[PDB]
């Protein structure tokens, strides 16, 4: 296979991890709209939403790790230029950085809503 197909998969799968989290938050906000805001409930929403974030961050770490694996398996391939493999590790770190940052944003956005 291709080095760039590793890059594709990583992004599609990371994008997928992230919209999964956003979607869980959108539905979460709708469930919260039918409940009276209370300080203890406000303490319960944040814990839930933060714990959801973590699940999403973990999903993304796993995509990177599997992409790194896929990058290494191409190592044992003469038909793959070994000197291009680093670049893939780098590319998947940049997507991870992006994915995590977008999760941090979506969380930050949400916590504002729960406390506002």
């Amino acid at each position: 296979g291709s080095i760039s197909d590793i890059r594709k998969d990583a992004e599609v799968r990371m994008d997928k991890a992230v919209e999964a989290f956003k979607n869980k938050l959108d539905k979460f906000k709708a469930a919260v709209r039918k409940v009276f805001p209370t300080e203890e409930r406000i303490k319960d929403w944040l814990k839930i939403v933060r714990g959801e974030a973590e699940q999403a961050r973990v999903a993304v770490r796993n995509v990177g790790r599997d992409a790194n694996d896929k990058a290494a398996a191409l190592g044992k391939d003469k038909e793959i230029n070994w000197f291009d493999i680093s670049q893939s590790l780098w590319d998947v770190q940049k997507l991870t950085d992006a994915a995590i940052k977008k999760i941090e944003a979506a969380l930050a956005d949400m916590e504002a809503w729960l406390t506002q």
Epitope: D69, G75, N81, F83, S86, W90, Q93
Partner: antibody, heavy 123, light 109 residues
Framework: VQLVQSGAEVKRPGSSVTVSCKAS????????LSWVRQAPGRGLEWMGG????????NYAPRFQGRITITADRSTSTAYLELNSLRPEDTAVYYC?????????????????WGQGTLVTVSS | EIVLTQSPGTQSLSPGERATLSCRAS???????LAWYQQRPGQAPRLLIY???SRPSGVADRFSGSGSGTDFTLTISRLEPEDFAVYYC?????????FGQGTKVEVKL
């Protein structure tokens, strides 16, 4: 980025040599580290390399069967083990690491070089 | 396997002259992954050019690289004395990286 190599070593034929190379500064896990040698008065020759994150190795066919390259991630140290030595293996062994653009994008070309380690195989 | 070949073997020039060094590959270098290194006596090689024409920061602009495919050139426009050294090309366009045999540029006094 600084690479520092182990010291000179005098070996007999049939012995193994293990050269060490520690990255000081820089990111280490993710950048390709190559070993490259130079026999007295002769050209540079590429031997092989390793990307440390998952020990992704790449050996030159002419050494396959004699060579092993590994990296210890905590100590930023890469390793060349050369087995079954012969007088033709008398060279200076340089560790060399790929350069970045500007952590930065990897370029392949060896931007960073160690001070070389002299291995003399003496009958 | 890609055999790289440098021409001429030796180069005898005065300071201020323009030196042009050749490197030719038996087959095409994958994605023009060719590097040019300078090695002064008793010293480890120094990267001058990469990806055929890219110059890394800190390398003087009198060094430049060009060519594609199987035919490559390094040019040193105005030799300074400290340029007396051996120059190798490298290709890393496939997993078996291989170097040229070397051009020695002799300056003069």
């Amino acid at each position: 980025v600084q690479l520092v190599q182990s010291g000179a070593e005098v070996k007999r034929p049939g012995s193994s040599v293990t050269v060490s190379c520690k990255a000081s500064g820089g990111s280490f896990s993710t950048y390709a580290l190559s070993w490259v040698r130079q026999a007295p008065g002769r050209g540079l020759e590429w031997m092989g390399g390793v990307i440390p994150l998952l020990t992704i190795t790449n050996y030159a066919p002419r050494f396959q069967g004699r060579i092993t390259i590994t990296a210890d991630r905590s100590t930023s140290t890469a390793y060349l083990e050369l087995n079954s030595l012969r007088p033709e293996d008398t060279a200076v062994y340089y560790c060399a690491r790929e350069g970045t653009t500007g952590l930065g994008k990897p370029i392949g070309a060896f931007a960073h070089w160690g001070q070389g380690t002299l291995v003399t195989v003496s009958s | 396997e890609i055999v790289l070949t440098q021409s001429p073997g030796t180069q005898s020039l005065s300071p201020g002259e323009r030196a042009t060094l050749s490197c030719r590959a038996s087959q095409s270098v994958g994605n023009n992954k060719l590097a040019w290194y300078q090695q002064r006596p008793g010293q480890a090689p120094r990267l001058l050019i990469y990806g055929a024409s890219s110059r890394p920061s800190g390398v003087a602009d009198r060094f430049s690289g060009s060519g594609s495919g199987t035919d490559f050139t390094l040019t040193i426009s105005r030799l300074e004395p400290e340029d007396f050294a051996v120059y190798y090309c490298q290709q890393y366009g496939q997993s078996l990286s291989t170097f040229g045999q070397g051009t020695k540029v002799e300056v003069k006094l």
